[PDB]
């Protein structure tokens, strides 16, 4: 799942 | 010891039932009771055994009921291997050394139709399932670790599939001296197993460190809190589910998400001299902002996450679902106000609270399947209110209402007014309402499609109890369903109390089941006679209180 | 004629007190201690040599879970949970004053997600204790009003 690029500590919607 | 005095009753399900209890004082802090219960319709003796014990681990009660053969059950199930019925119950609770905590709540029955046919002491015909929980915990002032197992036996023959945690370990740690902040950490390790062999099985590991800064004054308070939620899912036996559903479950799933919540309260006071000299009124506004980012949880099966009721107290809750499988995103502000009225002695006599939730963005869990009555997503969607008024030392009134914009109707409501001169002299009226839209939204589809479920709830209940001549007690109860215009529960009871004995005669007509063939409810009428020997204790009550608890809708004191 | 609350929630005499219970590590004792620390109250051990300090003993805690409403087939629909807590606040010179708290909650039943409902029930219990704690704090001033009169 998730996306190709994601941040674990994001605070944004799609782990941006 | 010796034989107890027998009791009897007549029911529409077992005809004439005779009890012949026998006490057995085995030792101090533990005793037993053996009861042959002869039922004439089934033509056999149910052997009931009760074992009460006290120990260093705590206090416990066990019950084992066995009917070797049954006639009605044999007729209803001709191809069954045997007609024997049985019940096992174990309720234990204890704390040893102030740190060890042992809890056991175990119930098991041979068949789902057990409680509709026999007496309801540790179970009831209103129960939909039997719970089997064990829990051992170690708790100290800043720490607690609990390992528990939960299993459920579902009685309804619609879908017997259920999930159980085997085992679940919860750990909580606190520390309140980290500078100005207060910190805590929560951890959990759970194993989800389904009764069916084709349903998915899971292993979940969850960590949640939270840090909050509180600040307080004589007139206001504000608490900020930042938390992180890390969850790891290992899912197996998911071939069958993936074979039929477009949404595919994943074996290994990682869900990491932050949460920011800021709460604030204010208190205002005034001397309400217009209404009463010396009476005080407090107006307390309260606000909260909650932000949790979206996370696509569509590839995680829902094991123990369910929608939560939103009363006034629940408006400020930080979670939309129980458990940890579903964690809805949130960008919302909850606003409420509570008015309290205290008398001259600083005793609270009145309170009324009203609150609402404003959603800036839609709350998405990734897997949204709830069927609302409209497509409202942002704005003031949830409203709640409650009130409690102590009119005098004998009169009391409580009320609550929950309105949801998405349902386009009042979601739920309840009310009650009670007069109570003493334990024996009391009257009470209560009303419960749950709209059909709420039933359709927060319950399975066959609930919406079923005739016994789709009407919602609209129930009016009256309870009365009065003594006569200081030796007679009369108790009555009547719960009536306004939607179907049919009675749901009815109870009468008369007890004569003397110096050395008490004689009780009770009667109850209650809803007991559903007739799928003719499509009407089933009613069970019972009338029991029970005499007990007094004089061995200081209890001189008239028996009104435990008479009021006999029916399937027991009396509760609303003050 | 409104104005901000110019007096603290807990009375000035009960700023430093002793929290005594038979289950000091239980959830109710933890909730009461957290609520007292929220209001800037200093809690001492039960063996504290300081005299003339009010002592709050937490009594028995009762939790009942009954059926409030039923469906057309007799199955339960709403479960009503009742929490009853008792405590005694002793001013060592004056007297012992008893106080109590009652918390009402309700939740719908669903056998098909029964385990989840159980978790919800646990959450409800974790709420209720906190509410009960606030109720106990809200009877702290009245006990003071019961002491000046005598
Ligand atoms: C303790 C009480 C005080 C708490 C602090 C105040 C909380 C309120 C501010 C929250 C900030 C988010 O901003 C608040 O919500 C959304 C964004 O989420 C903004 O809304 C804007 O962006 C959203 C994107 O989500 C668009 O869909 C919307 O059309 C646009 O108006 C609102 O105009 C603003 O009111
Ligand atoms: C202090 C804040 C307010 C809460 C205090 C307590 C007051 C509420 C308790 C009494 C409940 C009265 O209940 C309220 O009225 C009736 C049932 O009576 C329902 O009202 C119903 O009216 C008609 C006829 O049945 C339907 O077409 C309608 O859709 C439905 O709403 C409400 O949905 C319910 O909310
Ligand atoms: C606050 C006041 C509380 C006290 C009032 C409630 C107690 C009074 C009894 C009410 C219930 C009695 O139920 C009412 O009468 C009889 C039983 O008597 C029911 O009828 C029943 O009769 C006999 C039992 O005698 C059954 O074999 C039969 O199958 C059934 O139809 C009616 O369908 C119902 O209308
Ligand atoms: C599943 C996942 N993966 C990454 C890299 N980040 C997030 C937030 N979630």
Numbering used by the authors:
A (entry chain C): 1 to 16
B (entry chain A): 226 to 784
C (entry chain B): 1000 to 1149
Question: What does the original paper state about this entry?
Answer:
LPS biogenesis systems are essential in most Gram-negative bacteria, with LptDE responsible for the delivery of LPS to the outer leaflet of the OM. These β-strands are connected by turns on the periplasmic side and extended loops on the extracellular face that fold over the lumen of the barrel and require rearrangement to allow LPS molecules to reach the external surface.
To confirm the SPR competition binning, four additional cryo-EM data sets using different Bicycle molecules were collected from competition bin 1, which had the most unique sequences. All five imaged molecules (Compounds 1–5) in this epitope had an aligned sequence contacting the β-barrel of SfLptD, with a ubiquitous W×(D/EE) motif making a consistent interaction. In each of these interactions, the Bicycle molecule tryptophan indicated was docked into a hydrophobic pocket formed by Pro483, Phe485, Tyr516, and Pro518 on LptD, with further stabilization coming from hydrogen bonds formed by the guanidinium group of Arg520 and the hydroxyl group of Tyr516 contacting both the amino acid backbone and the side chain functional groups of the D/EE residues. The remaining residues of the five Bicycle molecules aligned poorly, especially in the regions facing the detergent micelle. Compounds 1, 2, and 5 were subject to an alanine-substitution experiment – residues highlighted in green could be substituted with an alanine with little to no effect on binding affinity to SfLptDEFL, residues in yellow resulted in a marked decrease in affinity and residues labeled in red were not tolerant to substitution, completely losing any binding to SfLptDE. Mutation of the key residues in the W×D/EE motif resulted in significant aberration in peptide binding to SfLptDE; substitution of the tryptophan residue with an alanine abolishes binding in SPR while substituting the aspartic/glutamic acid residues with an alanine significantly weakens peptide affinity to LptDE. Overall, this indicated a level of motif specificity in Bicycle molecules binding to SfLptDE, despite the relatively small interaction surfaces, demonstrating this high-throughput screening process did not select for merely nonspecific detergent-binding molecules.
